[PDB]
Ligand SMILES: Cc1cn([C@H]2C[C@H](OP(=O)(O)O)[C@@H](COP(=O)(O)O)O2)c(=O)[nH]c1=O
């Protein structure tokens with residue numbers, strides 16, 4: 001797996017972000033995560049966490065997995081990195097997202113994310129409190 005450049009067009013919500021990748025605007029859905037909606041418990045803070053992290057980054061990167069690169073809704077499927085730090089992981093590590101949607105073709109960072117989730121759960125953070 002390799003990181004590739006992109007730029008932020010717009011933070012959308014906890015699980016999606018609009019980026020420019022190879023010069024074309026694209027909505028990306030973050031691999032391996034599910035974030036509570038804004039109306040749900042921790043929703044507001046979960047999106048704000050995600051929004052900040054992408055908006056404050058000076059360098060955004062995208063890393064596709066080995067399986068399909070776009071979902072059935074035309075969304076790009078990747079791990080998103082902000083100044084070298086994986087957004088997908090970081091959300092889970094804060095207890096502001098859950099590991100979810102782990103499909104066979106695109107699961108490279110599963111155990112990494114599950115560890116982050118086990119840490120947040122051990123600390124009883126946020127959705128685990
Ligand atoms: C994260 C991810 C979601 N999806 C699809 C499954 C879900 O389909 P359904 O719409 O049929 O439930 C939907 C969840 O995305 P959201 O959590 O953004 O809604 O996106 C994939 O197909 N591949 C993936 O890797």
Ligand SMILES: [Ca+2]
Pocket residue numbers: 015034035
């Ligand atoms: Ca979602």
